[PDB]
Amino acid sequence: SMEQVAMELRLTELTRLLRSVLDQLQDKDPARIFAQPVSLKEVPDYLDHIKHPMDFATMRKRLEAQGYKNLHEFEEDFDLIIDNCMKYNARDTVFYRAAVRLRDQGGVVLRQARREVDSIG
C-alpha cells in the first residue's frame, strides 16, 4: 500500500538523521574506546558483569538495517555504551573518564536531534 511506503520513507529519513547523529557522537570518542565490542577473548568475565554490551560498530549495524524505529531506541543503545563502561571500570581510569566526556559532549548533540525529530516528524 501507499501508506506502507510512506511509513518506510519516514523510517529511511530517520535513519539518515540518526546516521549523522551517530557520526557526530563518535567524533566525541577520538581515542576509539567505544568503537568496537569488548572482546571476550581479552575480557573473559565481561558478560558476568555487563548483561547488554554495546558499542558504536554494533549500533552502526543496527542503523544500516534500519533497525531504530525512533530516537528513544537509538538513545537507549548510546546510554548502554556509557553506562556499561561506568560500571565495569573505576572512576580513576581512562575508560571511565572517556565515558563521562562522551556523555557530556553527546548530550548537546542529542538535545538538538530530539528537536529535529519532533520538528520534521
Side-chain angles (χ1 to χ4, degrees), residues 85-109:
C85 183
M86 296 173 68
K87 292 174 191 74
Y88 191 82
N89 305 107
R91 227 166 12 260
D92 71 334
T93 60
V94 62
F95 310 108
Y96 185 111
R97 287 165 177 277
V100 169
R101 292 164 61 83
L102 178 61
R103 188 200 61 185
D104 284 351
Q105 292 190 294
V108 181
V109 174

mmCIF file with all atom_site columns, all heavy atoms in Angstrom, residues 85-109:
data_model
loop_
_atom_site.group_PDB
_atom_site.id
_atom_site.type_symbol
_atom_site.label_atom_id
_atom_site.label_alt_id
_atom_site.label_comp_id
_atom_site.label_asym_id
_atom_site.label_entity_id
_atom_site.label_seq_id
_atom_site.pdbx_PDB_ins_code
_atom_site.Cartn_x
_atom_site.Cartn_y
_atom_site.Cartn_z
_atom_site.occupancy
_atom_site.B_iso_or_equiv
_atom_site.pdbx_formal_charge
_atom_site.auth_seq_id
_atom_site.auth_comp_id
_atom_site.auth_asym_id
_atom_site.auth_atom_id
_atom_site.pdbx_PDB_model_num
ATOM 1   N N   . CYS A 1 85  ? 30.284 1.090  30.650 1.00 0.00 ? 85  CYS A N   1
ATOM 2   C CA  . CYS A 1 85  ? 31.730 1.468  30.903 1.00 0.00 ? 85  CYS A CA  1
ATOM 3   C C   . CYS A 1 85  ? 31.855 2.017  32.300 1.00 0.00 ? 85  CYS A C   1
ATOM 4   O O   . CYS A 1 85  ? 32.847 1.682  33.019 1.00 0.00 ? 85  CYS A O   1
ATOM 5   C CB  . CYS A 1 85  ? 32.085 2.547  29.882 1.00 0.00 ? 85  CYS A CB  1
ATOM 6   S SG  . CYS A 1 85  ? 33.838 3.034  30.016 1.00 0.00 ? 85  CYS A SG  1
ATOM 7   N N   . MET A 1 86  ? 30.934 2.867  32.732 1.00 0.00 ? 86  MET A N   1
ATOM 8   C CA  . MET A 1 86  ? 30.992 3.451  34.047 1.00 0.00 ? 86  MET A CA  1
ATOM 9   C C   . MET A 1 86  ? 30.750 2.450  35.183 1.00 0.00 ? 86  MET A C   1
ATOM 10  O O   . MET A 1 86  ? 31.054 2.781  36.366 1.00 0.00 ? 86  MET A O   1
ATOM 11  C CB  . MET A 1 86  ? 30.067 4.694  34.203 1.00 0.00 ? 86  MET A CB  1
ATOM 12  C CG  . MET A 1 86  ? 30.579 5.769  33.267 1.00 0.00 ? 86  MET A CG  1
ATOM 13  S SD  . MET A 1 86  ? 29.616 7.304  33.029 1.00 0.00 ? 86  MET A SD  1
ATOM 14  C CE  . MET A 1 86  ? 29.826 7.989  34.623 1.00 0.00 ? 86  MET A CE  1
ATOM 15  N N   . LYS A 1 87  ? 30.177 1.292  34.864 1.00 0.00 ? 87  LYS A N   1
ATOM 16  C CA  . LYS A 1 87  ? 30.060 0.215  35.873 1.00 0.00 ? 87  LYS A CA  1
ATOM 17  C C   . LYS A 1 87  ? 31.317 -0.669 35.922 1.00 0.00 ? 87  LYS A C   1
ATOM 18  O O   . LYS A 1 87  ? 31.852 -0.898 37.026 1.00 0.00 ? 87  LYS A O   1
ATOM 19  C CB  . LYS A 1 87  ? 28.735 -0.566 35.687 1.00 0.00 ? 87  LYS A CB  1
ATOM 20  C CG  . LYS A 1 87  ? 27.551 0.339  36.028 1.00 0.00 ? 87  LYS A CG  1
ATOM 21  C CD  . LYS A 1 87  ? 26.271 -0.385 35.703 1.00 0.00 ? 87  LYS A CD  1
ATOM 22  C CE  . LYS A 1 87  ? 25.083 0.491  35.746 1.00 0.00 ? 87  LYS A CE  1
ATOM 23  N NZ  . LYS A 1 87  ? 24.948 1.412  34.629 1.00 0.00 ? 87  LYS A NZ  1
ATOM 24  N N   . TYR A 1 88  ? 31.774 -1.132 34.789 1.00 0.00 ? 88  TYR A N   1
ATOM 25  C CA  . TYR A 1 88  ? 32.880 -2.058 34.735 1.00 0.00 ? 88  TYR A CA  1
ATOM 26  C C   . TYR A 1 88  ? 34.176 -1.468 35.166 1.00 0.00 ? 88  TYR A C   1
ATOM 27  O O   . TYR A 1 88  ? 35.004 -2.070 35.891 1.00 0.00 ? 88  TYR A O   1
ATOM 28  C CB  . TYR A 1 88  ? 33.001 -2.662 33.358 1.00 0.00 ? 88  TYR A CB  1
ATOM 29  C CG  . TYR A 1 88  ? 33.943 -3.808 33.307 1.00 0.00 ? 88  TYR A CG  1
ATOM 30  C CD1 . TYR A 1 88  ? 33.558 -5.103 33.697 1.00 0.00 ? 88  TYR A CD1 1
ATOM 31  C CD2 . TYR A 1 88  ? 35.306 -3.621 32.880 1.00 0.00 ? 88  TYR A CD2 1
ATOM 32  C CE1 . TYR A 1 88  ? 34.452 -6.142 33.710 1.00 0.00 ? 88  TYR A CE1 1
ATOM 33  C CE2 . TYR A 1 88  ? 36.208 -4.678 32.897 1.00 0.00 ? 88  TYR A CE2 1
ATOM 34  C CZ  . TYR A 1 88  ? 35.783 -5.928 33.337 1.00 0.00 ? 88  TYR A CZ  1
ATOM 35  O OH  . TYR A 1 88  ? 36.715 -6.995 33.306 1.00 0.00 ? 88  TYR A OH  1
ATOM 36  N N   . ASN A 1 89  ? 34.374 -0.200 34.788 1.00 0.00 ? 89  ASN A N   1
ATOM 37  C CA  . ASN A 1 89  ? 35.629 0.483  35.062 1.00 0.00 ? 89  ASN A CA  1
ATOM 38  C C   . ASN A 1 89  ? 35.541 1.460  36.197 1.00 0.00 ? 89  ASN A C   1
ATOM 39  O O   . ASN A 1 89  ? 34.514 2.170  36.395 1.00 0.00 ? 89  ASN A O   1
ATOM 40  C CB  . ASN A 1 89  ? 36.109 1.224  33.795 1.00 0.00 ? 89  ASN A CB  1
ATOM 41  C CG  . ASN A 1 89  ? 36.225 0.305  32.610 1.00 0.00 ? 89  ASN A CG  1
ATOM 42  O OD1 . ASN A 1 89  ? 35.411 0.319  31.643 1.00 0.00 ? 89  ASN A OD1 1
ATOM 43  N ND2 . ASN A 1 89  ? 37.239 -0.437 32.616 1.00 0.00 ? 89  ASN A ND2 1
ATOM 44  N N   . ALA A 1 90  ? 36.587 1.613  36.984 1.00 0.00 ? 90  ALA A N   1
ATOM 45  C CA  . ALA A 1 90  ? 36.590 2.530  38.127 1.00 0.00 ? 90  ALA A CA  1
ATOM 46  C C   . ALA A 1 90  ? 36.746 3.929  37.714 1.00 0.00 ? 90  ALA A C   1
ATOM 47  O O   . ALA A 1 90  ? 37.225 4.304  36.641 1.00 0.00 ? 90  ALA A O   1
ATOM 48  C CB  . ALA A 1 90  ? 37.659 2.066  39.131 1.00 0.00 ? 90  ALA A CB  1
ATOM 49  N N   . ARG A 1 91  ? 36.327 4.839  38.591 1.00 0.00 ? 91  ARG A N   1
ATOM 50  C CA  . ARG A 1 91  ? 36.465 6.306  38.381 1.00 0.00 ? 91  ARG A CA  1
ATOM 51  C C   . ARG A 1 91  ? 37.806 6.862  37.970 1.00 0.00 ? 91  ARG A C   1
ATOM 52  O O   . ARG A 1 91  ? 37.901 7.857  37.186 1.00 0.00 ? 91  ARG A O   1
ATOM 53  C CB  . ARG A 1 91  ? 35.988 6.974  39.696 1.00 0.00 ? 91  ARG A CB  1
ATOM 54  C CG  . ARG A 1 91  ? 35.073 8.082  39.571 1.00 0.00 ? 91  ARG A CG  1
ATOM 55  C CD  . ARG A 1 91  ? 34.366 8.481  40.895 1.00 0.00 ? 91  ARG A CD  1
ATOM 56  N NE  . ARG A 1 91  ? 34.752 7.987  42.205 1.00 0.00 ? 91  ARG A NE  1
ATOM 57  C CZ  . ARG A 1 91  ? 34.152 7.006  42.872 1.00 0.00 ? 91  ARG A CZ  1
ATOM 58  N NH1 . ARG A 1 91  ? 33.128 6.356  42.346 1.00 0.00 ? 91  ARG A NH1 1
ATOM 59  N NH2 . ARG A 1 91  ? 34.581 6.678  44.062 1.00 0.00 ? 91  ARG A NH2 1
ATOM 60  N N   . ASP A 1 92  ? 38.885 6.252  38.469 1.00 0.00 ? 92  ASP A N   1
ATOM 61  C CA  . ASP A 1 92  ? 40.257 6.648  38.207 1.00 0.00 ? 92  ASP A CA  1
ATOM 62  C C   . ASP A 1 92  ? 40.837 6.187  36.840 1.00 0.00 ? 92  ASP A C   1
ATOM 63  O O   . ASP A 1 92  ? 42.047 6.422  36.561 1.00 0.00 ? 92  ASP A O   1
ATOM 64  C CB  . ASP A 1 92  ? 41.164 6.223  39.398 1.00 0.00 ? 92  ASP A CB  1
ATOM 65  C CG  . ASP A 1 92  ? 41.384 4.709  39.510 1.00 0.00 ? 92  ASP A CG  1
ATOM 66  O OD1 . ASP A 1 92  ? 40.533 3.905  39.044 1.00 0.00 ? 92  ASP A OD1 1
ATOM 67  O OD2 . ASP A 1 92  ? 42.407 4.279  40.115 1.00 0.00 ? 92  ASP A OD2 1
ATOM 68  N N   . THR A 1 93  ? 40.017 5.647  35.942 1.00 0.00 ? 93  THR A N   1
ATOM 69  C CA  . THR A 1 93  ? 40.551 5.038  34.781 1.00 0.00 ? 93  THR A CA  1
ATOM 70  C C   . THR A 1 93  ? 40.318 5.882  33.557 1.00 0.00 ? 93  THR A C   1
ATOM 71  O O   . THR A 1 93  ? 39.297 6.648  33.510 1.00 0.00 ? 93  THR A O   1
ATOM 72  C CB  . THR A 1 93  ? 39.944 3.652  34.505 1.00 0.00 ? 93  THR A CB  1
ATOM 73  O OG1 . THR A 1 93  ? 38.508 3.724  34.306 1.00 0.00 ? 93  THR A OG1 1
ATOM 74  C CG2 . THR A 1 93  ? 40.239 2.613  35.624 1.00 0.00 ? 93  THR A CG2 1
ATOM 75  N N   . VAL A 1 94  ? 41.159 5.718  32.500 1.00 0.00 ? 94  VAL A N   1
ATOM 76  C CA  . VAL A 1 94  ? 40.926 6.439  31.248 1.00 0.00 ? 94  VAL A CA  1
ATOM 77  C C   . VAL A 1 94  ? 39.590 6.020  30.597 1.00 0.00 ? 94  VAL A C   1
ATOM 78  O O   . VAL A 1 94  ? 38.938 6.788  29.936 1.00 0.00 ? 94  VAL A O   1
ATOM 79  C CB  . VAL A 1 94  ? 42.115 6.190  30.285 1.00 0.00 ? 94  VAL A CB  1
ATOM 80  C CG1 . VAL A 1 94  ? 42.284 4.717  29.895 1.00 0.00 ? 94  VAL A CG1 1
ATOM 81  C CG2 . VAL A 1 94  ? 41.969 6.973  29.039 1.00 0.00 ? 94  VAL A CG2 1
ATOM 82  N N   . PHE A 1 95  ? 39.174 4.760  30.809 1.00 0.00 ? 95  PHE A N   1
ATOM 83  C CA  . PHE A 1 95  ? 37.887 4.294  30.217 1.00 0.00 ? 95  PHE A CA  1
ATOM 84  C C   . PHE A 1 95  ? 36.713 5.017  30.814 1.00 0.00 ? 95  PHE A C   1
ATOM 85  O O   . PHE A 1 95  ? 35.838 5.555  30.094 1.00 0.00 ? 95  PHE A O   1
ATOM 86  C CB  . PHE A 1 95  ? 37.774 2.771  30.438 1.00 0.00 ? 95  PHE A CB  1
ATOM 87  C CG  . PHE A 1 95  ? 38.963 2.033  30.019 1.00 0.00 ? 95  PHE A CG  1
ATOM 88  C CD1 . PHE A 1 95  ? 39.840 1.463  30.954 1.00 0.00 ? 95  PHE A CD1 1
ATOM 89  C CD2 . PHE A 1 95  ? 39.195 1.801  28.702 1.00 0.00 ? 95  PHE A CD2 1
ATOM 90  C CE1 . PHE A 1 95  ? 40.915 0.684  30.575 1.00 0.00 ? 95  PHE A CE1 1
ATOM 91  C CE2 . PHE A 1 95  ? 40.300 1.034  28.290 1.00 0.00 ? 95  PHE A CE2 1
ATOM 92  C CZ  . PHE A 1 95  ? 41.198 0.518  29.250 1.00 0.00 ? 95  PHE A CZ  1
ATOM 93  N N   . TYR A 1 96  ? 36.624 5.071  32.137 1.00 0.00 ? 96  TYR A N   1
ATOM 94  C CA  . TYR A 1 96  ? 35.502 5.765  32.822 1.00 0.00 ? 96  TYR A CA  1
ATOM 95  C C   . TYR A 1 96  ? 35.462 7.204  32.417 1.00 0.00 ? 96  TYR A C   1
ATOM 96  O O   . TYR A 1 96  ? 34.408 7.750  32.135 1.00 0.00 ? 96  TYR A O   1
ATOM 97  C CB  . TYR A 1 96  ? 35.647 5.610  34.343 1.00 0.00 ? 96  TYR A CB  1
ATOM 98  C CG  . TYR A 1 96  ? 34.499 6.174  35.199 1.00 0.00 ? 96  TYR A CG  1
ATOM 99  C CD1 . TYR A 1 96  ? 33.657 5.354  35.903 1.00 0.00 ? 96  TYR A CD1 1
ATOM 100 C CD2 . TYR A 1 96  ? 34.359 7.553  35.389 1.00 0.00 ? 96  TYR A CD2 1
ATOM 101 C CE1 . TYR A 1 96  ? 32.608 5.856  36.632 1.00 0.00 ? 96  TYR A CE1 1
ATOM 102 C CE2 . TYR A 1 96  ? 33.367 8.071  36.202 1.00 0.00 ? 96  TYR A CE2 1
ATOM 103 C CZ  . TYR A 1 96  ? 32.517 7.205  36.849 1.00 0.00 ? 96  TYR A CZ  1
ATOM 104 O OH  . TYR A 1 96  ? 31.498 7.731  37.629 1.00 0.00 ? 96  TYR A OH  1
ATOM 105 N N   . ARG A 1 97  ? 36.645 7.835  32.442 1.00 0.00 ? 97  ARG A N   1
ATOM 106 C CA  . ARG A 1 97  ? 36.711 9.267  32.144 1.00 0.00 ? 97  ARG A CA  1
ATOM 107 C C   . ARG A 1 97  ? 36.282 9.532  30.726 1.00 0.00 ? 97  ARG A C   1
ATOM 108 O O   . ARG A 1 97  ? 35.663 10.575 30.449 1.00 0.00 ? 97  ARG A O   1
ATOM 109 C CB  . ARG A 1 97  ? 38.096 9.779  32.497 1.00 0.00 ? 97  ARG A CB  1
ATOM 110 C CG  . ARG A 1 97  ? 38.272 9.854  34.011 1.00 0.00 ? 97  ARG A CG  1
ATOM 111 C CD  . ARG A 1 97  ? 39.686 9.993  34.489 1.00 0.00 ? 97  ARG A CD  1
ATOM 112 N NE  . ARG A 1 97  ? 39.738 10.125 35.967 1.00 0.00 ? 97  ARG A NE  1
ATOM 113 C CZ  . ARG A 1 97  ? 39.570 11.242 36.684 1.00 0.00 ? 97  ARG A CZ  1
ATOM 114 N NH1 . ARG A 1 97  ? 39.291 12.430 36.123 1.00 0.00 ? 97  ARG A NH1 1
ATOM 115 N NH2 . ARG A 1 97  ? 39.649 11.145 38.020 1.00 0.00 ? 97  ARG A NH2 1
ATOM 116 N N   . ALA A 1 98  ? 36.625 8.640  29.802 1.00 0.00 ? 98  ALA A N   1
ATOM 117 C CA  . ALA A 1 98  ? 36.256 8.817  28.373 1.00 0.00 ? 98  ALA A CA  1
ATOM 118 C C   . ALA A 1 98  ? 34.723 8.778  28.261 1.00 0.00 ? 98  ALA A C   1
ATOM 119 O O   . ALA A 1 98  ? 34.125 9.465  27.459 1.00 0.00 ? 98  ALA A O   1
ATOM 120 C CB  . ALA A 1 98  ? 36.883 7.758  27.538 1.00 0.00 ? 98  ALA A CB  1
ATOM 121 N N   . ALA A 1 99  ? 34.124 7.868  28.992 1.00 0.00 ? 99  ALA A N   1
ATOM 122 C CA  . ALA A 1 99  ? 32.661 7.728  29.024 1.00 0.00 ? 99  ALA A CA  1
ATOM 123 C C   . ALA A 1 99  ? 31.982 8.995  29.569 1.00 0.00 ? 99  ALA A C   1
ATOM 124 O O   . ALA A 1 99  ? 30.958 9.458  29.007 1.00 0.00 ? 99  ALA A O   1
ATOM 125 C CB  . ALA A 1 99  ? 32.188 6.476  29.858 1.00 0.00 ? 99  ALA A CB  1
ATOM 126 N N   . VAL A 1 100 ? 32.514 9.595  30.648 1.00 0.00 ? 100 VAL A N   1
ATOM 127 C CA  . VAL A 1 100 ? 31.967 10.815 31.155 1.00 0.00 ? 100 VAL A CA  1
ATOM 128 C C   . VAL A 1 100 ? 31.997 11.925 30.069 1.00 0.00 ? 100 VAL A C   1
ATOM 129 O O   . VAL A 1 100 ? 30.992 12.651 29.921 1.00 0.00 ? 100 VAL A O   1
ATOM 130 C CB  . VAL A 1 100 ? 32.755 11.276 32.406 1.00 0.00 ? 100 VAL A CB  1
ATOM 131 C CG1 . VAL A 1 100 ? 32.364 12.694 32.777 1.00 0.00 ? 100 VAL A CG1 1
ATOM 132 C CG2 . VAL A 1 100 ? 32.497 10.320 33.508 1.00 0.00 ? 100 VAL A CG2 1
ATOM 133 N N   . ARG A 1 101 ? 33.129 12.069 29.406 1.00 0.00 ? 101 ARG A N   1
ATOM 134 C CA  . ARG A 1 101 ? 33.321 13.104 28.412 1.00 0.00 ? 101 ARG A CA  1
ATOM 135 C C   . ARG A 1 101 ? 32.429 12.872 27.177 1.00 0.00 ? 101 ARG A C   1
ATOM 136 O O   . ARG A 1 101 ? 31.827 13.848 26.648 1.00 0.00 ? 101 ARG A O   1
ATOM 137 C CB  . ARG A 1 101 ? 34.777 13.185 27.974 1.00 0.00 ? 101 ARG A CB  1
ATOM 138 C CG  . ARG A 1 101 ? 35.662 13.698 29.117 1.00 0.00 ? 101 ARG A CG  1
ATOM 139 C CD  . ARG A 1 101 ? 37.121 13.407 28.839 1.00 0.00 ? 101 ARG A CD  1
ATOM 140 N NE  . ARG A 1 101 ? 37.571 14.068 27.618 1.00 0.00 ? 101 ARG A NE  1
ATOM 141 C CZ  . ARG A 1 101 ? 37.962 15.340 27.547 1.00 0.00 ? 101 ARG A CZ  1
ATOM 142 N NH1 . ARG A 1 101 ? 37.970 16.139 28.639 1.00 0.00 ? 101 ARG A NH1 1
ATOM 143 N NH2 . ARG A 1 101 ? 38.393 15.802 26.351 1.00 0.00 ? 101 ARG A NH2 1
ATOM 144 N N   . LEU A 1 102 ? 32.260 11.611 26.796 1.00 0.00 ? 102 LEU A N   1
ATOM 145 C CA  . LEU A 1 102 ? 31.313 11.240 25.720 1.00 0.00 ? 102 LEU A CA  1
ATOM 146 C C   . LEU A 1 102 ? 29.886 11.548 26.116 1.00 0.00 ? 102 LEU A C   1
ATOM 147 O O   . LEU A 1 102 ? 29.114 12.150 25.288 1.00 0.00 ? 102 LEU A O   1
ATOM 148 C CB  . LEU A 1 102 ? 31.470 9.785  25.336 1.00 0.00 ? 102 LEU A CB  1
ATOM 149 C CG  . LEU A 1 102 ? 30.519 9.278  24.291 1.00 0.00 ? 102 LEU A CG  1
ATOM 150 C CD1 . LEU A 1 102 ? 30.677 10.041 22.990 1.00 0.00 ? 102 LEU A CD1 1
ATOM 151 C CD2 . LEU A 1 102 ? 30.830 7.788  24.011 1.00 0.00 ? 102 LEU A CD2 1
ATOM 152 N N   . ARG A 1 103 ? 29.448 11.247 27.324 1.00 0.00 ? 103 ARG A N   1
ATOM 153 C CA  . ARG A 1 103 ? 28.120 11.547 27.765 1.00 0.00 ? 103 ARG A CA  1
ATOM 154 C C   . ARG A 1 103 ? 27.882 13.082 27.725 1.00 0.00 ? 103 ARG A C   1
ATOM 155 O O   . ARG A 1 103 ? 26.800 13.593 27.248 1.00 0.00 ? 103 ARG A O   1
ATOM 156 C CB  . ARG A 1 103 ? 27.981 11.009 29.190 1.00 0.00 ? 103 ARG A CB  1
ATOM 157 C CG  . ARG A 1 103 ? 26.624 11.015 29.866 1.00 0.00 ? 103 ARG A CG  1
ATOM 158 C CD  . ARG A 1 103 ? 26.889 10.909 31.366 1.00 0.00 ? 103 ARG A CD  1
ATOM 159 N NE  . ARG A 1 103 ? 27.655 12.013 31.882 1.00 0.00 ? 103 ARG A NE  1
ATOM 160 C CZ  . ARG A 1 103 ? 28.091 12.105 33.122 1.00 0.00 ? 103 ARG A CZ  1
ATOM 161 N NH1 . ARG A 1 103 ? 27.886 11.159 33.950 1.00 0.00 ? 103 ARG A NH1 1
ATOM 162 N NH2 . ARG A 1 103 ? 28.763 13.157 33.495 1.00 0.00 ? 103 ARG A NH2 1
ATOM 163 N N   . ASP A 1 104 ? 28.845 13.822 28.240 1.00 0.00 ? 104 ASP A N   1
ATOM 164 C CA  . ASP A 1 104 ? 28.664 15.293 28.389 1.00 0.00 ? 104 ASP A CA  1
ATOM 165 C C   . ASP A 1 104 ? 28.576 15.973 27.029 1.00 0.00 ? 104 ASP A C   1
ATOM 166 O O   . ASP A 1 104 ? 27.621 16.724 26.763 1.00 0.00 ? 104 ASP A O   1
ATOM 167 C CB  . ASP A 1 104 ? 29.800 15.848 29.216 1.00 0.00 ? 104 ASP A CB  1
ATOM 168 C CG  . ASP A 1 104 ? 29.638 15.545 30.739 1.00 0.00 ? 104 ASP A CG  1
ATOM 169 O OD1 . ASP A 1 104 ? 28.558 15.051 31.166 1.00 0.00 ? 104 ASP A OD1 1
ATOM 170 O OD2 . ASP A 1 104 ? 30.619 15.823 31.489 1.00 0.00 ? 104 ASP A OD2 1
ATOM 171 N N   . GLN A 1 105 ? 29.472 15.594 26.143 1.00 0.00 ? 105 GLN A N   1
ATOM 172 C CA  . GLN A 1 105 ? 29.523 16.126 24.817 1.00 0.00 ? 105 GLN A CA  1
ATOM 173 C C   . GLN A 1 105 ? 28.377 15.600 23.972 1.00 0.00 ? 105 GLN A C   1
ATOM 174 O O   . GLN A 1 105 ? 27.838 16.370 23.126 1.00 0.00 ? 105 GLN A O   1
ATOM 175 C CB  . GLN A 1 105 ? 30.860 15.817 24.188 1.00 0.00 ? 105 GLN A CB  1
ATOM 176 C CG  . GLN A 1 105 ? 31.974 16.594 24.885 1.00 0.00 ? 105 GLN A CG  1
ATOM 177 C CD  . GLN A 1 105 ? 33.265 16.481 24.136 1.00 0.00 ? 105 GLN A CD  1
ATOM 178 O OE1 . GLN A 1 105 ? 33.827 15.419 24.049 1.00 0.00 ? 105 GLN A OE1 1
ATOM 179 N NE2 . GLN A 1 105 ? 33.752 17.590 23.614 1.00 0.00 ? 105 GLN A NE2 1
ATOM 180 N N   . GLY A 1 106 ? 27.998 14.343 24.141 1.00 0.00 ? 106 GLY A N   1
ATOM 181 C CA  . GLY A 1 106 ? 26.923 13.740 23.353 1.00 0.00 ? 106 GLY A CA  1
ATOM 182 C C   . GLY A 1 106 ? 25.562 14.330 23.706 1.00 0.00 ? 106 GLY A C   1
ATOM 183 O O   . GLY A 1 106 ? 24.665 14.439 22.822 1.00 0.00 ? 106 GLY A O   1
ATOM 184 N N   . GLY A 1 107 ? 25.389 14.762 24.954 1.00 0.00 ? 107 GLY A N   1
ATOM 185 C CA  . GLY A 1 107 ? 24.109 15.388 25.406 1.00 0.00 ? 107 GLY A CA  1
ATOM 186 C C   . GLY A 1 107 ? 23.717 16.575 24.528 1.00 0.00 ? 107 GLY A C   1
ATOM 187 O O   . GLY A 1 107 ? 22.550 16.705 24.099 1.00 0.00 ? 107 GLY A O   1
ATOM 188 N N   . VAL A 1 108 ? 24.693 17.410 24.204 1.00 0.00 ? 108 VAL A N   1
ATOM 189 C CA  . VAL A 1 108 ? 24.481 18.574 23.343 1.00 0.00 ? 108 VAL A CA  1
ATOM 190 C C   . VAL A 1 108 ? 23.858 18.171 21.960 1.00 0.00 ? 108 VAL A C   1
ATOM 191 O O   . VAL A 1 108 ? 22.876 18.746 21.479 1.00 0.00 ? 108 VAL A O   1
ATOM 192 C CB  . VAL A 1 108 ? 25.827 19.285 23.051 1.00 0.00 ? 108 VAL A CB  1
ATOM 193 C CG1 . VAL A 1 108 ? 25.609 20.512 22.173 1.00 0.00 ? 108 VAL A CG1 1
ATOM 194 C CG2 . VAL A 1 108 ? 26.548 19.643 24.365 1.00 0.00 ? 108 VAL A CG2 1
ATOM 195 N N   . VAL A 1 109 ? 24.420 17.127 21.380 1.00 0.00 ? 109 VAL A N   1
ATOM 196 C CA  . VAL A 1 109 ? 24.063 16.637 20.061 1.00 0.00 ? 109 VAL A CA  1
ATOM 197 C C   . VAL A 1 109 ? 22.666 16.044 20.117 1.00 0.00 ? 109 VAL A C   1
ATOM 198 O O   . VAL A 1 109 ? 21.783 16.243 19.221 1.00 0.00 ? 109 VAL A O   1
ATOM 199 C CB  . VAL A 1 109 ? 25.082 15.574 19.623 1.00 0.00 ? 109 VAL A CB  1
ATOM 200 C CG1 . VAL A 1 109 ? 24.706 14.887 18.312 1.00 0.00 ? 109 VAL A CG1 1
ATOM 201 C CG2 . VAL A 1 109 ? 26.479 16.200 19.548 1.00 0.00 ? 109 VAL A CG2 1
#
